[PDB]
Design an enzyme around this catalytic site. Sequence first.
Site, PDB file in Angstrom:
ATOM      1  N   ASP A   6       0.859  -1.219   0.000  1.00 44.88           N
ATOM      2  CA  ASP A   6       0.000   0.000   0.000  1.00 44.88           C
ATOM      3  C   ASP A   6       0.888   1.260   0.000  1.00 44.88           C
ATOM      4  O   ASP A   6       0.485   2.231  -0.668  1.00 44.88           O
ATOM      5  CB  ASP A   6      -0.963   0.044   1.210  1.00 44.88           C
ATOM      6  CG  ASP A   6      -2.304  -0.659   1.054  1.00 44.88           C
ATOM      7  OD1 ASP A   6      -2.519  -1.373   0.026  1.00 44.88           O
ATOM      8  OD2 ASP A   6      -3.171  -0.461   1.960  1.00 44.88           O
ATOM      9  N   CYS A  20      -2.726   0.581 -13.461  1.00 41.48           N
ATOM     10  CA  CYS A  20      -2.740   0.575 -11.982  1.00 41.48           C
ATOM     11  C   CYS A  20      -3.954   1.416 -11.581  1.00 41.48           C
ATOM     12  O   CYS A  20      -4.990   1.281 -12.235  1.00 41.48           O
ATOM     13  CB  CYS A  20      -1.369   0.977 -11.420  1.00 41.48           C
ATOM     14  SG  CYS A  20      -0.610   2.463 -12.186  1.00 41.48           S
ATOM     15  N   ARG A  24       3.192   2.556 -10.973  1.00 42.86           N
ATOM     16  CA  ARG A  24       3.507   1.110 -11.155  1.00 42.86           C
ATOM     17  C   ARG A  24       3.521   0.729 -12.649  1.00 42.86           C
ATOM     18  O   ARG A  24       4.404  -0.065 -13.079  1.00 42.86           O
ATOM     19  CB  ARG A  24       2.474   0.277 -10.391  1.00 42.86           C
ATOM     20  CG  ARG A  24       2.475   0.585  -8.902  1.00 42.86           C
ATOM     21  CD  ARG A  24       1.394  -0.187  -8.186  1.00 42.86           C
ATOM     22  NE  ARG A  24       1.179   0.398  -6.885  1.00 42.86           N
ATOM     23  CZ  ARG A  24       0.249  -0.022  -6.012  1.00 42.86           C
ATOM     24  NH1 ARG A  24      -0.576  -1.010  -6.339  1.00 42.86           N
ATOM     25  NH2 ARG A  24       0.147   0.579  -4.824  1.00 42.86           N
ATOM     26  N   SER A  25       2.551   1.206 -13.414  1.00 45.89           N
ATOM     27  CA  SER A  25       2.432   0.945 -14.874  1.00 45.89           C
ATOM     28  C   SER A  25       3.709   1.395 -15.593  1.00 45.89           C
ATOM     29  O   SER A  25       4.196   0.659 -16.491  1.00 45.89           O
ATOM     30  CB  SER A  25       1.217   1.655 -15.454  1.00 45.89           C
ATOM     31  OG  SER A  25      -0.033   1.079 -15.013  1.00 45.89           O
ATOM     32  N   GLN A  80       6.238   7.932 -10.580  1.00 44.66           N
ATOM     33  CA  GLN A  80       5.559   9.007  -9.771  1.00 44.66           C
ATOM     34  C   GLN A  80       6.431   9.488  -8.607  1.00 44.66           C
ATOM     35  O   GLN A  80       6.092  10.580  -8.048  1.00 44.66           O
ATOM     36  CB  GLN A  80       4.232   8.493  -9.195  1.00 44.66           C
ATOM     37  CG  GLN A  80       3.095   8.520 -10.196  1.00 44.66           C
ATOM     38  CD  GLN A  80       1.793   8.104  -9.540  1.00 44.66           C
ATOM     39  OE1 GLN A  80       1.527   6.919  -9.312  1.00 44.66           O
ATOM     40  NE2 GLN A  80       0.982   9.086  -9.190  1.00 44.66           N
TER      41      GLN A  80
END
Length: 283
Positions: free
Chosen positions: A181, A215, A221-222, A262
């Site tokens: 998370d 994602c 994440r992508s 990110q």
Amino acid sequence: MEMEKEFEQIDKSGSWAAIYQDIRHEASDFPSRVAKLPKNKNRNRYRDVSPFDHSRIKLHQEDNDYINASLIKMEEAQRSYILTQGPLPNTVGHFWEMVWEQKSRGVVMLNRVMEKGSLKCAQYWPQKEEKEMIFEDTNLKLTLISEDIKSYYTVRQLELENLTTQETREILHFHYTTWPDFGVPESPASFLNFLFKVRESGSLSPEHGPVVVHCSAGIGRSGTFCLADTCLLLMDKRKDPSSVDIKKVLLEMRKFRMGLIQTADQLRFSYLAVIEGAKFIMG
Ligand SMILES: CNC(=S)N(Cc1ccccc1)Cc1cccnc1
């Protein structure tokens, strides 16, 4: 400069936040005018994450062709990817329309439906064989065929039917279920293991349409998934595996979708995944 040594130099100097801001500063800025039209407000999960006009995927319909999705075309590597947001309750039909129209074989999901106690994407696939899903707005039917649950990921076999023509196709769903998370995984071994299975499936190969990767926002994440795949493919093709510059590959990918990678931690994790993969990719 061998990325290994560049890695240890940034780590010992603790300059990850500085490298990351340099990328943010040099990144492309292209218009996203279609994304911002008032008719499209409920088709965007996040106000600050939009596809560029020049690389957006168009739906094949006259009413409204818009979806929050981008085509990332990597010319030297000979790989293409579609990066998209997690589907919303009112865009699950658009999502499966895009998979159908682009002739994709695979969908790669890097998030859980619920994270941090909030919904990060719609439940857009069936959970039981005998309870199929019908998308009335796009005229598609989706059936769960089989499910293979592993410790770090789940693979599903799905059947997508175009109810207009009664053609069917087998779609493979690759669900990475253990991204934490907060932050990034401590070791890239399970992420690398998951990537290997996607390639092995045929989902990334040029005989199919581009893989769909998502994602929640479709940039973080992508971004890490396509950056690692492309850098390892270039190291396989070049006479000098040491000429692969991860920062330059990332800026090339950011010509096609804003904001890929990110955080400074995601940038460091992408270096670790490629670096570890090299030693194996080296025979
Ligand atoms: C820790 N796993 C690593 S570094 N792999 C290498 C790899 C190369 C390209 C893309 C994805 C992964 C996968 C693997 C699987 C079975 C036996 N050895 C290695």
